[PDB]
Design a protein around this nucleic acid. Structure first.
Ligand SMILES: [Mg+2]
Ligand SMILES: [Mg+2]
Ligand SMILES: [Mg+2]
Ligand SMILES: [Mg+2]
Ligand SMILES: [Mg+2]
Ligand SMILES: [Mg+2]
Ligand SMILES: [Mg+2]
Ligand SMILES: [Mg+2]
Ligand SMILES: [Mg+2]
Lengths: 51, 183, 171, 147, 114, 48
RNA sequence: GCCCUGAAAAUGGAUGGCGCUCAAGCGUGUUACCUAUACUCUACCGUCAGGGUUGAUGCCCUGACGAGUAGGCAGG
RNA sequence: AAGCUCGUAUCAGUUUUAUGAGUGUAAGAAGUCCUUGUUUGAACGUGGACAUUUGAAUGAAGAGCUUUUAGUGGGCCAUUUUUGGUAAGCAGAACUGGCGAUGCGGGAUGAACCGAACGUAGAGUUAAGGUGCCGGAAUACACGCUCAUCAGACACCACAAAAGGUGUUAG
RNA sequence: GGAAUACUGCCAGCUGGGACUGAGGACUGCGACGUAAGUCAAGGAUGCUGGCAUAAUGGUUAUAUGCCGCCCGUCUUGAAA
């Protein structure tokens, strides 16, 4: 009889997607990435700074 | 994709990402004084009223349609969050020629279960990755009836190209902000 | 809008027996990447015989100012569309950034020459290393040693409709 | 406004209701509407659709035509169903023993059928005997032969 | 160069009726010196049939169905081969797809500024 | 008209057996008929 | 580029008016704001369509639509 | 408006592909395969078979065939092609839009201008146009230009010779 | 050499104020929190309290104020003209 938005209604969100509980519990919306130490090449830097 | 660009830069090369396979198109002009061929293309893309939106698979056959209806639509490349919010809030299914809201996974399982789609998340997956049943899933989705943007269009005059300070044409990644404002 | 500077590197699509086409790089002043790529394809079609459908964009990268908090003098070589043809123009702008100088130049072209963004072509923006190479007086008058000037007739903004004292323009 | 691709408020039609004021005909319409809704029988659908037709679209069916239909192999013991009037024919001299269900029988047709030894029944008796129209043969009279 | 009734031809001049340049139609009449051609022309919201009489040198054979016949033969051959050797085959044409990702190396091809 | 590259076929010629004939040939025949009529009228004027 | 001259009659009157001069003028840029019978959500009316139903040309459920002269059909 | 059928049926003011012209045609049951009869080859055939991976994209629940009649038929305006031009206006063809039959917002006001087409209401957001006061909304912010002894706030056509000026600014 | 910040984008992160609406009328469905019986914001509003109990709200009527509103029918493209 009435349409309820899952983005606002938590019960409807859980009804439509059981994985939302796991997503919220594991905080997958703010997951940290693994740090890498890759450096750009000298040719790339020279091309970027070239006029 | 992030690491592929970093490795290419470290190796002195350039990583070119694959071209977009999906666009989202919203009709921005009304139904008065439309030339016949663009009117026919709008009807073929199911944009029969202002602030109506649809997903289009990007091929050579559809890029020419988008080129034909360029002065009357705003289209771009939707993100996963934009697609998810559109399907969650304004997602409706065409069942027996009726517009039915997608309030349960049983509806989607009953109508698109023969294509392996069992839930709204499966429908979103089939939309975001243009799969073998993209045509059936997209035609099952009723054309999205968006509102006017909540913060305005951001320009004084809408009917110029987005490049020239207007609103129509391909705005690429800014369709996400526009559609989230209109949703 | 607030201009940004990009480098856009593109090429032709690789064909049979002609692999690794030559890469071409341009520096474009634009508000966003869509406008930057549009200007790049426009200039590439104007100079070479390469079309957008026949080529591709290899890279687009925003270039930031090296020392954004240092006052600099810029010589700007530009040309504008006219019926007789392209006419050169040289301007000198004192600013802290190339994008700020470009925005100032576009505002000046709109105010004086009644010119538009798609009509103005930016050829070169060059920082003037030595002050002796500055050759416009409206820039040279600010290079004087120990320059001080006042601001006579100060007008203060009022937030109320009525005031209970006669205003003063002292400073 | 929207740019309509189809006509708005378009009636399907399909002859929903009969135009007659006959109470018994309306009772038959009600009975076969129930049967067509609750049996999924194409025979019931056809009989219900034929109950709505007009007089010019329900031509009479002759007893000689019924006999010619019954002469087919395998149809010698089927019940002949005519949604309309069954008329007599003096051009045929031999009539088989058969059961005929029709809206109306003329006096000569009923006399000929009874003399042959069968029976004439109505559509409600037909519905009671065969609710799914088992072993039935629907006959329609010629249309274009009149002008 | 023999023309028969039912062939598809193109009207190509080697001044009047300049509208029928590049028009494609069906031959209905063949004589010793002239050829009759059927042309369907849009008039209002309907196509009207028109008879055109042309010289021999102003028409030529059309290749409008050549690709279709070749594709029919190729599809028949591929279907027979895939029936003889059981595997999934694709027979329908497809539009051009967007290109995939690639890595462009600046080995000898250092980008140049213009 | 004989050298004209393309001639539209008249709607009045339809329904007759003379449709398959070249309109250029038909017009040449009509011109020859008119010339012979003029010659016959000249001969008649000479006789009278 | 802007400014002045670059021709004007005849009752008293017009950037719509007041008036405006680092404009409330001209060119351009960035935002905020105002409000259509347009768009979005909801209720109600009617129409059409699709289903269900042993006062049944009635009842229940669902969806979408609604400009109009001549003229046509229907219910009052 | 009536009937008979069909209903993955019939399609499309569109794109794609192939092939012409400098926009036309075509894209499968109105098929294809084996087998060698018809007047060593074109063109017509004897019998059998492969289907829901049946022949590009997108959209579409109504389509096809027969009967059956109310009102109307020489209007204006605009855009895009082509031909002839005139003091200057323009004239003759092809095609497509708007209007008459149509209200609503804006352009002060309005037959063709800009938005947008209409059940009765509530709330929100906008279009075009605007935010000194009349008048709902910044005497907002920022860079420049201009002073006219009736500036300008305009239709981008004409006066207009890109003419005249010891006005001003930038090249 | 090591940080920070801007900008852009994401969160099935949290939380405060304001407005309009409350259709439906036993139950059935999809779910959530719980070992559990049970509970719940999950197939559309309930709970507590006050004043009045009549011209108070409301309707009608005469007028005032803000804004809008050209005289109908006919005939002619088109009519205030
Ligand atoms: Mg707001
Ligand atoms: Mg605006
Ligand atoms: Mg004003
Ligand atoms: Mg301004
Ligand atoms: Mg409506
Ligand atoms: Mg005000
Ligand atoms: Mg004058
Ligand atoms: Mg009151
Ligand atoms: Mg008024």
């Amino acid at each position: 009889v009435l349409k309820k938005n899952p983005l606002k209604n938590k019960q409807v969100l859980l009804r439509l997607n059981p994985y939302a509980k796991v997503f919220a519990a594991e905080k997958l919306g703010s997951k940290k990435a693994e740090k890498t130490g890759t450096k750009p090449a000298a040719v790339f830097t020279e091309t970027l700074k070239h006029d | 994709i992030i690491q592929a660009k970093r490795d290419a830069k470290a190796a002195g090369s350039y990583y070119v990402e694959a071209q977009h396979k999906l666009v989202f198109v919203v009709r921005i002009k009304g139904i008065n004084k439309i030339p016949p061929k663009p009117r026919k293309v709008l009807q073929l893309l199911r944009l029969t009223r202002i602030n109506s939106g649809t997903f289009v698979k990007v091929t050579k056959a559809t890029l020419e349609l988008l080129k034909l209806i360029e002065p009357y639509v705003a289209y771009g490349y939707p993100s996963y969050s934009t697609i998810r919010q559109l399907v969650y809030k304004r997602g409706f299914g065409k069942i027996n020629k009726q517009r039915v809201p997608l309030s349960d996974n049983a509806i989607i399982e009953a109508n698109l279960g023969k294509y392996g789609i069992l839930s709204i998340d499966d429908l979103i997956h089939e939309i975001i990755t243009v799969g073998p049943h993209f045509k059936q899933a997209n035609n099952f989705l009723w054309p999205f009836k968006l509102s006017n943007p909540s913060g305005g269009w951001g320009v004084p005059r809408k009917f110029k190209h987005f490049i020239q300070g207007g609103s129509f044409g391909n705005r690429e990644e800014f369709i996400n902000k526009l559609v989230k404002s209109m949703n | 809008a607030h201009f940004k500077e990009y480098q856009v590197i593109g090429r032709r699509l690789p064909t049979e027996s002609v692999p690794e086409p030559k890469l071409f790089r341009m520096r474009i002043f634009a508000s966003n990447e869509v406008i930057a790529k549009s200007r790049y394809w426009y200039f590439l079609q104007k100079l070479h015989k390469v079309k957008k459908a026949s080529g591709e964009i290899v890279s687009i990268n925003q270039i930031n100012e090296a020392h954004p908090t240092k006052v600099k003098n810029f010589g700007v070589w530009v040309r504008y569309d006219s019926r007789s043809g392209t006419h050169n123009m040289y301007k000198e702008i004192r600013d802290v950034s190339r994008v700020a100088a470009v925005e100032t130049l576009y505002q000046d072209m709109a105010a004086r020459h009644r010119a538009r963004f798609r009509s103005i072509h930016i050829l070169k923006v060059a920082e003037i290393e030595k002050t002796a190479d500055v050759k416009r007086q409206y820039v040279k008058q600010f290079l004087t040693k120990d320059l001080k000037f006042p601001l006579p007739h100060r007008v203060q903004k009022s937030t109320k409709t009525f005031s209970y004292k006669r205003p003063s323009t002292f400073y | 406004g929207i740019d309509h691709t189809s006509k708005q408020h378009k009636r399907s039609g399909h002859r929903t209701a009969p135009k007659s004021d006959n109470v018994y005909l309306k009772l038959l319409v009600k009975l076969y509407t129930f049967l067509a809704r609750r049996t999924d029988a194409p025979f019931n659908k056809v009989v219900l659709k034929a109950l709505f037709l007009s007089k010019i679209n329900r031509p009479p069916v002759s007893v000689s035509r019924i006999a010619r239909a019954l002469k087919q192999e395998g149809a010698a013991n089927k019940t002949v169903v005519v949604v309309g009037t069954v008329t007599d024919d003096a051009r045929i001299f031999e009539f088989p023993k058969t059961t005929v269900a029709a809206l109306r029988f003329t006096a000569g047709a009923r006399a000929k059928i009874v003399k042959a030894g069968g029976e004439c029944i109505t559509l409600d008796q037909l519905a009671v005997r065969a609710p799914k129209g088992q072993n039935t043969l629907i006959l329609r009279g010629p249309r274009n032969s009149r002008e | 160069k023999v023309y028969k009734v039912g062939d598809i031809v193109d009207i190509k001049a080697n001044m009047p009726h300049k509208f029928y340049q590049g028009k494609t139609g069906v031959v209905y009449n063949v004589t010793k010196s002239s050829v009759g051609v059927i042309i369907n022309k849009m008039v209002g919201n309907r196509y009207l049939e028109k008879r055109l009489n042309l010289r021999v040198e102003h028409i030529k054979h059309s290749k409008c169905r050549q690709e279709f016949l070749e594709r029919v033969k190729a599809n028949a051959a591929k279907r027979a081969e895939a029936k003889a050797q059981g595997v999934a085959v694709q027979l329908k044409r497809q539009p051009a797809q967007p290109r995939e990702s690639r890595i462009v190396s600046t080995e000898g091809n250092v980008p140049q500024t213009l | 008209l004989d050298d004209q590259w393309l001639v539209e076929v008249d709607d009045k010629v339809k329904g007759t057996d003379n449709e398959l004939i070249d309109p250029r040939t038909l017009n040449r025949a009509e011109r020859k008929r008119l010339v012979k009529k003029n010659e016959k009228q000249q001969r008649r004027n000479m006789k009278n």
